[PDB]
From Swiss-Prot, chains A, E:
Compartmental location: Nucleus, Nucleolus; Nucleus, Cajal body
Protein name: H/ACA ribonucleoprotein complex subunit 1
Domain topic, free-text comment: Interaction with SMN1 requires at least one of the RGG-box regions.
Gene Ontology terms: biological process: snoRNA guided rRNA pseudouridine synthesis; telomere maintenance via telomerase
GO molecular function: box H/ACA snoRNA binding; RNA binding; telomerase RNA binding
Main location: nucleus
Covalent cross-link (Glycyl lysine isopeptide (Lys-Gly) (interchain with G-Cter in SUMO2)), residues: K70
Function per UniProt: Required for ribosome biogenesis and telomere maintenance. Part of the H/ACA small nucleolar ribonucleoprotein (H/ACA snoRNP) complex, which catalyzes pseudouridylation of rRNA. This involves the isomerization of uridine such that the ribose is subsequently attached to C5, instead of the normal N1. Each rRNA can contain up to 100 pseudouridine ('psi') residues, which may serve to stabilize the conformation of rRNAs. May also be required for correct processing or intranuclear trafficking of TERC, the RNA component of the telomerase reverse transcriptase (TERT) holoenzyme.
Species of the source: Homo sapiens
Family of the protein in this entry: Belongs to the GAR1 family.
Domain of life: Eukaryota
GO cellular component, as recorded: box H/ACA scaRNP complex; box H/ACA snoRNP complex; box H/ACA telomerase RNP complex; chromosome, telomeric region; fibrillar center; nucleoplasm; telomerase holoenzyme complex
Keyword tags: Isopeptide bond, Nucleus, Repeat, Ribonucleoprotein, Ribosome biogenesis, RNA-binding, rRNA processing, Ubl conjugation
UniProtKB/Swiss-Prot annotation, chain B:
Organism encoding this protein: Homo sapiens
Disorder cited: Dyskeratosis congenita, autosomal recessive, 2: A rare multisystem disorder caused by defective telomere maintenance. It is characterized by progressive bone marrow failure, and the clinical triad of reticulated skin hyperpigmentation, nail dystrophy, and mucosal leukoplakia. Common but variable features include premature graying, aplastic anemia, low platelets, osteoporosis, pulmonary fibrosis, and liver fibrosis among others. Early mortality is often associated with bone marrow failure, infections, fatal pulmonary complications, or malignancy.
Protein's UniProt name: H/ACA ribonucleoprotein complex subunit 2
GO CC aspect terms: box H/ACA scaRNP complex; box H/ACA snoRNP complex; box H/ACA telomerase RNP complex; chromosome, telomeric region; nucleoplasm; sno(s)RNA-containing ribonucleoprotein complex; telomerase holoenzyme complex
Portion held of the full protein: 23 to 152 of 153
Domain of life from the UniProt record: Eukaryota
Lineage of source species: Eukaryota, Metazoa, Chordata, Craniata, Vertebrata
UniProtKB/Swiss-Prot annotation, chain C:
Record GO terms (molecular function): box H/ACA snoRNA binding; pseudouridine synthase activity; RNA binding; telomerase activity; telomerase RNA binding
Enzymatic reactions: uridine in 5S rRNA = pseudouridine in 5S rRNA
Keywords: Acetylation, Cataract, Cytoplasm, Deafness, Disease variant, Dyskeratosis congenita, Isomerase, Isopeptide bond, Nucleus, Phosphoprotein, Ribonucleoprotein, Ribosome biogenesis, RNA-binding, rRNA processing, Ubl conjugation
Parent sequence residues shown: 43 to 395 of 514
Active site: D83 (nucleophile)
Cross-link entry Glycyl lysine isopeptide (Lys-Gly) (interchain with G-Cter in SUMO2), positions: K1, K149, K352
Name of this protein: H/ACA ribonucleoprotein complex subunit DKC1
Curated annotation (Swiss-Prot), chain D:
Family that this chain belongs to: Belongs to the NOP10 family.
Molecular function (Gene Ontology), one example: RNA binding
Domain of life: Eukaryota
Major subcellular location class: nucleus
SUPFAM superfamilies: Nop10-like SnoRNP
UniProt keyword terms in alphabetical order: Cataract, Deafness, Disease variant, Dyskeratosis congenita, Nucleus, Ribonucleoprotein, Ribosome biogenesis, rRNA processing
Protein name: H/ACA ribonucleoprotein complex subunit 3
Any coiled-coil regions, as ranges: none
GO cellular component, one term: box H/ACA telomerase RNP complex
Gene: NOP10
Annotated function: Required for ribosome biogenesis and telomere maintenance. Part of the H/ACA small nucleolar ribonucleoprotein (H/ACA snoRNP) complex, which catalyzes pseudouridylation of rRNA. This involves the isomerization of uridine such that the ribose is subsequently attached to C5, instead of the normal N1. Each rRNA can contain up to 100 pseudouridine ('psi') residues, which may serve to stabilize the conformation of rRNAs. May also be required for correct processing or intranuclear trafficking of TERC, the RNA component of the telomerase reverse transcriptase (TERT) holoenzyme.
Length: 97, 130, 353, 64, 97
RNA sequence: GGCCGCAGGAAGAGGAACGGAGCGAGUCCCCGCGGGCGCGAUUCCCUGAGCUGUGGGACGUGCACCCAGGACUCGCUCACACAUG
């Protein structure tokens, strides 16, 4: 169901073919799970994380939107939030010591 | 001692054997067990009354609930088999050389204790019926 | 001699009928129903139940199967499962009494069980304290079934009592009063964890199923078979009428609403219980409360949901007293007597004229 | 099995493990007799329960 | 693997047949998942939550210990910790409004 | 108690069938249920220290169990009932 809390995932950039591209701004540069539910700060599910791309410390993500949502609705620099358990640390993707 | 066991008797436990008749029946069972000529369970006694094997059927008068063995008195009356109650199930089991109780035993006749069997049989048939 | 009897000694749902609030005393009696105890043996069984003492080998669904062979009926229900090795109070509803099974299944149970502890404890007082700890609303994991992991759930234990303890065998009798769907096997495991020694439920017996208990009116499976035999071979009802009881005995706790004979058949067809047909009504009827609607002969018509309180019934002159939850009585037990009243006649007259 | 009982002075079951009650009488088993649906001894049970006045029909009728 | 953080689950009471019974002391009276890994404050897995029992607001839990652990090792009132994502809120088990 | 601000109203109080029931189906909930019952022959074996003769087991064999409810949804039937002073 709705999670107990949600942490800042990222901010809205331009839409792209009926899903929304977003710049990732997580604390500690954490990376989301694939198909992780994306929420607005009201804890309402807008979609799911589809693509993750860009440089390690400056990466983006696309969001495959929900049944009822439209890509025209979102404004520039609108923030999106994620359940903190389906984040992963950046250290996992960095090379082994 | 006998009168204390008389408290524990059932509604249906009649005719109850006399104190001396109870002693005769136990001694007849001991001899029959030695000769391998008794049946012990309701499961067993019921099976061989159905086949029509004759014998004195001794019942425990403190058996509860009565539903476990209360069909057997009438099964005997259908076939004219002699039956009798005795004070306790533990003593009936003890008579057959067992620590655990039993609610019924059927003693078959045999040559080695034929006189003791006939003495018990005679007194059982002579009992007043309710 | 009924004239001599105080109203407190009248049977079933007519008990203490004079202490119900009287709306009106006038109605036209109809020769239709009987008192539930004097139903013709066929109808008596079809509206009846058995307070069974379940034996220790078969499952509870096997037992009610055996009952429906013996009595020669098509439907039975059973007031909550007892596990194959458990004995005790199992309300078996027959035919039209199966409409009441949810009320019986949801009722509060009582159990008398034996817990076997896997090591020695200090004494009987230590077990008695662990039972006090497991009073109130408890977590219990429902057992796995068809590899379907049911989630952890809450069930209330109202009272607990430590009856006896044997330090030799490490056996303890307990009595538990509890909500429906409580797992007593699970309780004994938890009681073992709480003591630290470990434990298992050795034995169990259900001593109460809501309204019925082992104290009175309880019968064994032999009585059920035996009573039917006596009816089949000698045409004697006497034994069956002590084994089976009418479903009205299950409803004696509910708040009552007595109806005129005119209204009875209307309600059986699915009409709402209207106020002009109410003769008498109990104190302490609340809104959205499950009530039993009865005839003047004490027969249960239906389980109804009250849309007026006791006080509201006293003030009003018409309207919906209650809506139906489940109709018990058959259609056309009483005749159709609806549309004959003054306002209903005026309506039909003024439509025609 | 293990559960036994004896009746108190107001007819309530008093459960116990011990084979004798506090007055020296034997305790009954809590559990009813084992049942078979293929039981053919209904005649027999009625016959002697009538004889000793312990058939259910001969007892005091319950107050409802 | 080892979780990012762990929250106070409960404290050690007596052992019981080679697993350990523990009084649950979670913030907001949260309830653990069945077979949820139990950790010491060093983030080393000691076992998994087996049973959950007792009253709603004062409940206990047993821990099925790991391959290498023994029930004799633990001291009285020793604290145990759980990954905060396999806790659930008490409201879930309380009745529907 | 008085004063100021915001919000909801600006209200004459209606309706003596409203909008029901009983079945059937699909889907959920409920849901610890290979075990239970009988007979046969070498008394079929067994007072096991193994539960157990108020029953346990072996081999033949047969037999009957695995629902009934509630909720939602889409049918069929019966009504559409204010209860006759």
């Amino acid at each position: 169901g709705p999670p107990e809390r949600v942490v800042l995932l990222g901010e809205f950039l331009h839409p792209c073919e009926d899903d929304i591209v977003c710049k990732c701004t997580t604390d500690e540069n954490k990376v989301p799970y694939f198909n992780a539910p994306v929420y607005l700060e009201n804890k309402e599910q807008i979609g799911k994380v589809d693509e993750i791309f860009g440089q390690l410390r400056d990466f983006y993500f696309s969001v495959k939107l929900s049944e009822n949502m439209k890509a025209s609705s979102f404004k520039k620099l609108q923030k999106f939030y994620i359940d903190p358990y389906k984040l992963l640390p950046l250290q996992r993707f960095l090379p082994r010591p | 001692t006998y009168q204390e066991l008389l408290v524990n008797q059932n509604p249906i436990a009649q005719p109850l054997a006399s104190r001396r008749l109870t002693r005769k029946l136990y001694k007849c069972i001991k001899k029959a067990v030695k000769q391998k000529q008794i049946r012990r369970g309701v499961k067993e006694v019921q099976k061989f009354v159905n086949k029509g094997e004759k014998g004195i059927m001794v019942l425990a008068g403190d058996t509860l609930p009565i539903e476990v063995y209360c069909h057997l008195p009438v099964m005997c009356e259908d076939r004219n088999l002699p039956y009798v109650y005795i004070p306790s199930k533990t003593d009936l089991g003890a008579a057959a050389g067992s620590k655990r109780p039993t609610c019924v035993i059927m003693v078959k006749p045999h040559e080695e204790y034929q006189e003791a069997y006939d003495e018990c049989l005679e007194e059982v048939q002579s009992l007043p019926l309710p | 001699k009924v004239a001599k009897l105080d109203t407190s000694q009248w049977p079933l749902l007519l008990k203490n009928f004079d202490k119900l609030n009287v709306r009106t005393t006038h109605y036209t009696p109809l020769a239709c129903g009987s008192n539930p105890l004097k139903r013709e043996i066929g109808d008596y069984i079809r509206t009846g139940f058995i307070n069974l003492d379940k034996p220790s080998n078969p499952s509870s669904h096997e037992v009610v199967a055996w009952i429906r062979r013996i009595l020669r009926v098509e439907k039975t229900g059973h007031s909550g499962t007892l596990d194959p090795k458990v004995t005790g109070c199992l309300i078996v509803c027959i035919e039209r009494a199966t409409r009441l099974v949810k009320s019986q299944q949801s009722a509060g149970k009582e159990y008398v069980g034996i817990v076997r502890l896997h090591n020695a404890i200090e004494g009987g007082t230590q077990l008695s304290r662990a039972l006090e700890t497991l009073t109130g609303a408890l977590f219990q994991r429902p057992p796995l079934i068809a590899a379907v992991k049911r989630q952890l759930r809450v069930r209330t234990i109202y009272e607990s009592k430590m009856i006896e303890y044997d330090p030799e065998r490490r056996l303890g009798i307990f009595w538990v009063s509890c909500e429906a769907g409580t797992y007593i096997r699970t309780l004994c495991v938890h009681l073992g964890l709480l003591l630290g020694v470990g434990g298992q439920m050795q034995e169990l017996r259900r001593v109460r199923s809501g309204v019925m208990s082992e104290k009175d009116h309880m019968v064994t499976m032999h009585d059920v078979l035996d009573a039917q035999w006596l009816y089949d071979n000698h045409k004697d009802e006497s034994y069956l009428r002590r084994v089976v009881y009418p479903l009205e005995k299950l409803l004696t706790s509910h708040k009552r609403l007595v109806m005129k004979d005119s209204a009875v058949n209307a309600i059986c067809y699915g009409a709402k219980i209207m106020l002009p047909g109410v003769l008498r009504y109990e104190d302490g009827i609340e809104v959205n409360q499950e009530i039993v609607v009865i005839t003047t002969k004490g027969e249960a018509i239906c389980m109804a949901i009250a849309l007026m309180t006791t006080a509201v019934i006293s003030t009003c002159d018409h309207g919906i007293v209650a809506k139906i939850k489940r109709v018990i009585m058959e259609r056309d037990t009483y005749p159709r007597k609806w549309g004959l009243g003054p306002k209903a006649s005026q309506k039909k007259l003024m439509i025609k004229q | 099995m293990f559960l036994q009982y004896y009746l108190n002075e107001q007819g309530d079951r008093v459960y116990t493990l011990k084979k004798f009650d506090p007055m020296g009488q034997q305790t009954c088993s809590a559990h009813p007799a084992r049942f078979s649906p293929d039981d053919k001894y209904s005649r027999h049970r009625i016959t002697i329960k009538k004889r000793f006045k312990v058939l259910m029909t001969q007892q005091p009728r319950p107050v409802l």
